[PDB]
Paper text:
To directly address this, we report the design of an expandable, modular protein platform for creating well-folded, new-to-nature proteins containing one or more redox-active heme cofactors. To this end, we created a single-chain variant of the D2 peptide with nanomolar heme affinity, [name], that we were able to crystalize, obtaining a high-resolution structure of the heme-bound maquette. To realize this single-chain variant of D2, termed [name], we designed a protein where four copies of the 25-residue D2 peptide were linked together by three short loops: two threonine-serine-asparagine (TSN) loops between helices 1 to 2 and 3 to 4 and one glycine-serine-valine-serine-proline (GSVSP) sequence at the central loop between helices 2 to 3. Following titrations of hemin into apo-[name], we established that [name] binds two molecules of heme B with high affinity, with an observed dissociation constant (KD) of <5 nM, and with no evidence of negative cooperativity.
To elucidate the structure of [name], we collected datasets at four wavelengths at the I03 beamline at Diamond light source, the fluorescence profile of the two iron atoms of the heme groups facilitating experimental phase determination of [name] by multiwavelength anomalous dispersion (MAD). We subsequently determined the crystal structures to resolutions of 1.9 Å and 2.1 Å for [name] and [name] T19D, respectively, using molecular replacement to elucidate the mutant structure. The crystal structure of [name] matches very well to the expected fold and design, with four helices arranged in an ordered coiled coil and the four histidine residues ligating each of the two heme cofactors across opposite helices. The identical helical regions fit the pseudo-D2 symmetry of the original parameterized peptide design. Each histidine is contacted by a threonine within hydrogen bonding distance (2.8 to 3.1 Å), most likely forming the “keystone” hydrogen bonding interactions of the original design and a common feature in natural transmembrane diheme components of respiratory enzymes. While the two shorter TSN loops on one side of the helical bundle are resolved in both structures, the flexible GSVSP loop between helices two and three is not observed in either. Heme plays a dominant role in the protein core, presenting a predominantly hydrophobic surface for connecting, in effect, two dimeric coiled coils with few interhelical interactions between them. The edge-to-edge distance between the conjugated tetrapyrrole rings of the heme cofactors is small (5.6 Å), and they are essentially within van der Waals contact; we would predict very rapid electron transfer between the heme groups (~1010 s−1) even with modest driving force (ΔG = 0.06 eV, λ = 0.7), similar to that observed in natural multiheme proteins. Interestingly, there is evidence of disorder in the heme B orientations within the binding pockets, with similar electron density visible in positions 1, 2, 3, and 4 of the tetrapyrrole ring.
Numbering used by the authors: 2 to 53, 60 to 111
The structure:
């Protein structure tokens, strides 16, 4: 449980740093994009595995799905409109906020 929670946290930090870096660029390398995606998948999978406030957990999970689905759409595009990029960053900050609120 604690080892799994700290893996999830460390993966989430790497998803945020890779995300923040790509936000500064009108185009990112396939290499950076796929690092971000493959980290996002491992963050999703460690979270699910921890379910192996119920209300805070439910909101966080739901938000994580919405961020992943906006990601699936950006995966189809060589370049992403800054409106899809904003929707994704916005939902993403909400997922980080709810995760951190689970510590307290
Ligand atoms: C997918 C994007 C996600 C991000 C960016 C994210 C991020 C975070 C962060 C930063 C924390 C706080 C970790 C800490 O400081 O200890 C956390 C906690 C947690 N997350 Fe996630 N998460 C994601 C997905 C999910 C999903 C899909 C689930 C389950 C469906 C999940 C389950 C949990 C649980 C249960 C905790 C609390 C751990 C505990 O109390 O021991 N996460 N998350
Ligand atoms: C848990 C959080 C996140 C998840 C699960 C996630 C997931 C994804 C996925 C699956 C993609 C598609 C990969 C691709 O387009 O090649 C993507 C793209 C992207 N994500 Fe994230 N992401 C998260 C957080 C963030 C954050 C915090 C930011 C910015 C601060 C961000 C910025 C981006 C950008 C800019 C792209 C598109 C890159 C491009 O068009 O070059 N992501 N994300």
């Amino acid at each position: 449980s604690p080892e799994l929670r700290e893996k999830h946290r460390a993966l989430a930090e790497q998803v945020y740093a890779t995300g923040q870096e790509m936000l500064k660029n009108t185009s990112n390398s396939p290499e950076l994009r796929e690092k971000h995606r493959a980290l996002a998948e491992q963050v999703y999978a460690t979270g699910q595995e921890m379910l192996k406030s119920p209300e805070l957990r439910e909101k966080h999970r739901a938000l994580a799905e919405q961020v992943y689905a906006t990601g699936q759409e950006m995966l189809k595009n060589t370049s992403n409109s800054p409106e899809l990029r904003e929707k994704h960053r916005a939902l993403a900050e909400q997922v980080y906020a709810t995760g951190q609120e689970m510590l307290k």
